Design an enzyme around this catalytic site. Sequence first.
Site, short mmCIF file in Angstrom:
data_model
loop_
_atom_site.label_atom_id
_atom_site.label_comp_id
_atom_site.label_asym_id
_atom_site.label_seq_id
_atom_site.Cartn_x
_atom_site.Cartn_y
_atom_site.Cartn_z
N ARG A 1 64.01 -10.45 -5.36
CA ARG A 1 65.10 -11.41 -5.20
C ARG A 1 64.74 -12.67 -4.44
NH1 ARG A 1 70.45 -11.27 -1.82
NH2 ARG A 1 71.73 -12.61 -3.15
N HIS B 1 65.07 -16.48 -5.74
CA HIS B 1 65.92 -17.45 -5.04
C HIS B 1 65.18 -18.61 -4.40
CE1 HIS B 1 70.14 -15.51 -4.57
NE2 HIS B 1 69.64 -15.34 -5.79
N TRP C 1 72.82 -1.10 -10.55
CA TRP C 1 72.86 -1.20 -12.00
C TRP C 1 72.34 0.10 -12.72
CZ3 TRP C 1 71.20 -5.19 -8.68
CH2 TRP C 1 71.92 -6.42 -8.75
C1 HEM Z 1 72.94 -15.35 -13.43
C2 HEM Z 1 71.90 -14.95 -12.73
C3 HEM Z 1 72.01 -14.03 -11.59
C4 HEM Z 1 73.10 -13.67 -10.81
C5 HEM Z 1 74.46 -14.23 -10.85
C6 HEM Z 1 72.62 -12.66 -9.94
C7 HEM Z 1 73.41 -12.04 -8.99
C8 HEM Z 1 72.95 -11.07 -8.12
C9 HEM Z 1 73.73 -10.49 -7.12
C10 HEM Z 1 75.15 -10.86 -6.80
C11 HEM Z 1 72.95 -9.57 -6.47
C12 HEM Z 1 73.36 -8.71 -5.30
C13 HEM Z 1 72.94 -9.35 -3.97
C14 HEM Z 1 73.40 -8.47 -2.80
O1 HEM Z 1 74.57 -8.10 -2.69
O2 HEM Z 1 72.64 -8.06 -1.91
C15 HEM Z 1 71.69 -9.58 -7.08
C16 HEM Z 1 70.68 -8.71 -6.74
C17 HEM Z 1 69.44 -8.85 -7.28
N1 HEM Z 1 69.04 -9.76 -8.23
FE1 HEM Z 1 70.14 -11.02 -9.17
N2 HEM Z 1 71.33 -12.42 -10.18
C18 HEM Z 1 70.89 -13.18 -11.15
C19 HEM Z 1 69.61 -13.28 -11.70
C20 HEM Z 1 68.50 -12.62 -11.20
C21 HEM Z 1 67.17 -12.89 -11.55
C22 HEM Z 1 66.74 -13.93 -12.57
C23 HEM Z 1 66.37 -12.04 -10.83
C24 HEM Z 1 64.90 -11.81 -10.88
C25 HEM Z 1 64.14 -12.15 -11.91
C26 HEM Z 1 67.25 -11.22 -10.06
C27 HEM Z 1 66.87 -10.20 -9.23
C28 HEM Z 1 67.73 -9.51 -8.38
C29 HEM Z 1 67.29 -8.37 -7.56
C30 HEM Z 1 65.90 -7.77 -7.53
C31 HEM Z 1 68.36 -7.95 -6.84
C32 HEM Z 1 68.46 -6.78 -5.85
C33 HEM Z 1 68.11 -7.12 -4.42
C34 HEM Z 1 68.46 -6.02 -3.45
O3 HEM Z 1 68.68 -4.82 -3.79
O4 HEM Z 1 68.57 -6.40 -2.25
N3 HEM Z 1 68.52 -11.63 -10.29
N4 HEM Z 1 71.70 -10.47 -8.13
#
Ligand code: HEM
Lengths: 104, 293
Positions: free
Chosen positions: B47, B51, B190
């Site tokens: 993440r 970001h 997920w």
């Molecule tokens: C429309 C695009 C995206 C949205 C709106 C989105 C939204 C989110 C949200 C809301 C979370 C949860 C954050 C939290 O509560 O701690 C998250 C987790 C995550 N996202 Fe995304 N995301 C997007 C695209 C991506 C992309 C492109 C990647 C990587 C290629 C990614 C990788 C991750 C990962 C690895 C986590 C988990 C982190 C953890 O467990 O702390 N996401 N995402």
Amino acid sequence: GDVEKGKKIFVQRCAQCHTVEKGGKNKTGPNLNGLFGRKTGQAPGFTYTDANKNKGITWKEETLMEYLENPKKYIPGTKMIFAGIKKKTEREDLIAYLKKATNE
Amino acid sequence: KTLVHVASVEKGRSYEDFQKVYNAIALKLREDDEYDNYIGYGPVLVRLAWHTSGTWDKHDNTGGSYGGTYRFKKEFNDPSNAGLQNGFKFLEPIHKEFPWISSGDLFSLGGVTAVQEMQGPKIPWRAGRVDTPEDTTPDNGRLPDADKDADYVRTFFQRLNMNDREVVALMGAHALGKTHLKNSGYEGPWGAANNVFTNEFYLNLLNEDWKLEKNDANNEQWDSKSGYMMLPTDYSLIQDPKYLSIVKEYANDQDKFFKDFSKAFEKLLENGITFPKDAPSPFIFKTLEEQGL
Ligand code: HEM
Ligand code: HEC
């Protein structure tokens, strides 16, 4: 091992795919009730891979200590998606939890 | 007056140097297994990599991975980045060990390392990001909103030069980790195999019964009785026809998913950077397993 510690490990690392109680659901993974002293591939009602089904080992402290370190290396072709617990003490705590919780 | 960022490799450093950085990250990753109820640090590193790169605006070349601007409060405190502090903390002892590496190179490399160590595809990586001053820090609000539909997703990603396949592929990183209500106001994973990189995100999206529900922060998310969730942007990939074709492809063929992800994520981590023709070719690092470590 530390039963109370093992349980938390289980709750967090295993419980999404496995139940422990007698009569518990088969989910992504097989119910584990009655696991100790029985052979691999014996949970009633679960469809195992051939690799799990026919491994031919008996589950107990020694064999789980090895499997849980790296499942796929011990049972190549397994469909359990779980990388492995690398720490010895953590495995030990989990195994003592299992020995209790899968046999009541 | 277009803004150009020329990659400049850390002086005298080459493949073996970057491999040690990789290995130091990978060993810490294996060691600190307790983090976040035993998910470990892999997802939050992935993440963080995204970001720090995902602020890029292709139209004026502002933001992007090059400057490593997340080290500044403005970006560190972006509401969109809450939770990523943990990844920064993880990397702090790694930066103390290698004070010669740039912040952008470290953030981006942490993602590559995490994906590979979780058994994802290999992801080629290039060094030479150079730290830029505090006034180069992009303002908050460039990262995407979760409470949106497919049209938002598609147009959002055009700003990062990503097309439909790139977008669907990149989103599959949601196989990893979870939403945390305190960070993002969404709660839940997920899938089941939280720290192994697979195509499970696509298989769950197609195969679970999703019900639209309000969570404890009053946001709406798609929930399964199974205890998994999808953000509205995730569920968007199956409401849109062209997106859904690609979700089905990835669900049916993990090798294809892995290939497309690897490309898109490299491209993501390299947006906005000009590499001299001179520059070394991309590095592909060995996993700890492959090195017998
Ligand atoms: C429309 C695009 C995206 C949205 C709106 C989105 C939204 C989110 C949200 C809301 C979370 C949860 C954050 C939290 O509560 O701690 C998250 C987790 C995550 N996202 Fe995304 N995301 C997007 C695209 C991506 C992309 C492109 C990647 C990587 C290629 C990614 C990788 C991750 C990962 C690895 C986590 C988990 C982190 C953890 O467990 O702390 N996401 N995402
Ligand atoms: C789903 C994402 C799972 C997680 C997390 C864990 N396990 Fe698992 N396990 C799963 C499946 C699908 C299977 C069958 C594999 C096959 O190829 O058929 C298993 C298998 C086991 C077994 C062997 C059971 C037998 O009857 O021989 C054990 C002892 C086992 N799993 C234990 C276990 C523990 C202790 C976990 C947390 C550390 C764990 N599993 C995670 C699916 C999933």
